Amino acid sequence: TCPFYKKIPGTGFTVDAFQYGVVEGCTAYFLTHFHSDHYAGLSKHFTFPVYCSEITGNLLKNKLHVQEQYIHPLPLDTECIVNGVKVVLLDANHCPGAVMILFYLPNGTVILHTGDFRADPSMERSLLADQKVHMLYLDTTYCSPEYTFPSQQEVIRFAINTAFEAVTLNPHALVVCGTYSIGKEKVFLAIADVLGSKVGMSQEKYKTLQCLNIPEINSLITTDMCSSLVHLLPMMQINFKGLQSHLKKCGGKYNQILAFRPTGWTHSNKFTRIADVIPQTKGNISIYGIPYSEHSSYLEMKRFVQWLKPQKIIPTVNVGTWKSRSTMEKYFREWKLEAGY
Numbered sequence: 487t488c489p490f491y492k493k494i495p496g497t498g499f500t501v502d503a504f505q506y507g508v509v510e511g512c513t514a515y516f517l518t519h520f521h522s523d524h525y526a527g528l529s530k531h532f533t534f535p536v537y538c539s540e541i542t543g544n545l546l547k548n549k550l551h552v553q554e555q556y557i558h559p560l561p562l563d564t565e566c567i568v569n570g571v572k573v574v575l576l577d578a579n580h581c582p583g584a585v586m587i588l589f590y591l592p593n594g595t596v597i598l599h600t601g602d603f604r605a606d607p608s609m610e611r612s613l614l615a616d617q618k619v620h621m622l623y624l625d626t627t628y629c630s631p632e633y634t635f636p637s638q639q640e641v642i643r644f645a646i647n648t649a650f651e652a653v654t655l656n657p658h659a660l661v662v663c664g665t666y667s668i669g670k671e672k673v674f675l676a677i678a679d680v681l682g683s684k685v686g687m688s689q690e691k692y693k694t695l696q697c698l699n700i701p702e703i704n705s706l707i708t709t710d711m712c713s714s715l716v717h718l719l720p721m722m723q724i725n726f727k728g729l730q731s732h733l734k735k736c737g738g739k740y741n742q743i744l745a746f747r748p749t750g751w752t753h754s755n756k757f758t759r760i761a762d763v764i765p766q767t768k769g770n771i772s773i774y775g776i777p778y779s780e781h782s783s784y785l786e787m788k789r790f791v792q793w794l795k796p797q798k799i800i801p802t803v804n805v806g807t808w809k810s811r812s813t814m815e816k817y818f819r820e821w822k823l824e825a826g827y
C-alpha cells in the first residue's frame with residue numbers, strides 16, 4: 487500500500503508510486519525521473535496515464551516498452567492543466583529528464599515536490615520566485631551537516647586533468663568509467679572530449695543514452711569498443727578482478743587501466759580535499775573514487791529551504807527510522823528559527 491508522502495492531497499495524483507498496484511482514487515501517476523527506486527512497477531502492461539518530462543517519456547517507451555497512448559510528456563517551465571489542476575515541471579538538477587513538480591491546488595494551497603534534486607541558487611530565479619509554497623516534499627538524502635562534497639565543476643576538473651596526464655605519459659593506457667543508471671554522464675563525456683576519443687559501451691547502454699536529448703551525441707558515443715580509449719562498464723566490474731578481465735579482452739592494445747567510480751558521498755570526504763584524492767592501485771591498474779553528487783549537500787539544501795520559506799516540510803528520503811526522522815525535524819526547526827519564517 488502507497489505511503490502518505492507519495493500522495494498529493496486534494497487531487498487524484500500520486501508521485502513515484504508504481505509498485506503498489508492500482509492506487510485507490512489515483513487518476514494520474516506522475517514520475518519525477520527514470521531511476522529504479524522511483525519507476526519500480528512500470529512495464530508494457532501499465533494502462534493508466536503517466537505524466538513526466540520528454541526525456542523520461544523516451545526512456546519509458548524504449549526501455550520499459552510502456553505504450554505510447556499512456557505516456558503524457560510535458561514541457562518544462564510551462565503552466566499545464568492536468569485533470570482540472572494547474573501544474574508546472576521544473577528542472578531538478580539531478581539526472582537527465584529529472585523534474586520537480588509544482589501543484590496549484592483547487593483550494594489555493596501551493597505544493598512543491600522536489601523529486602530527487604541538487605539544490606542550486608539558479609532555482610531562486612525559476613517560476614518559484616513568483617509565489618508562496620505552503621508544503622514542500624523534500625529530497626533529504628544528505629540532510630546532516632557531515633555531508634560535504636565539492637561542486638560538480640571541481641570534480642570534473644580533477645577527472646579531466648588526471649586522465650589527460652595519465653594517457654599523455656602512457657599512450658597505451660585505457661580509461662574506464664563505471665555506470666549503473668542514468669546520471670553523471672559529464673564524467674565520461676568530459677574525459678573522452680579531452681582525449682579526442684568517442685566513449686565505447688554496450689548496445690544496452692548506447693540505447694539508453696540515445697533517449698537523452700544530449701546535443702551532438704552521435705559525435706560522442708559508440709558501440710565499436712576497438713575504436714575508443716574511454717570505455718564504460720557496469721559499476722560492479724570496477725574492481726581489480728573485473729578490470730584485469732576486461733584488459734585481457736582488448737587484444738594487447740593496452741598495458742594499463744585508469745578507472746573512475748563516481749560515487750555519492752563517502753566518509754573519506756570528512757578528511758580529504760578533492761585535490762588530494764589518490765587511487766587504489768594493484769600492478770598496472772589504478773581506481774579513483776570521485777565524489778560526483780547529483781543530490782544537494784547539507785548547505786545547498788539549507789540555503790534552498792531558507793529561501794523558499796515553506797510552511798510545512800515532508801521528507802521523502804531517510805523516513806524509515808525514528809532517529810533519522812528526529813534528526814531531520816531538528817534541523818528544519820533550526821533553519822526556521824535562524825531565518826525568521
Ligand code: NI
Pocket residue numbers: 519521580602
Ligand atoms: Ni534519483
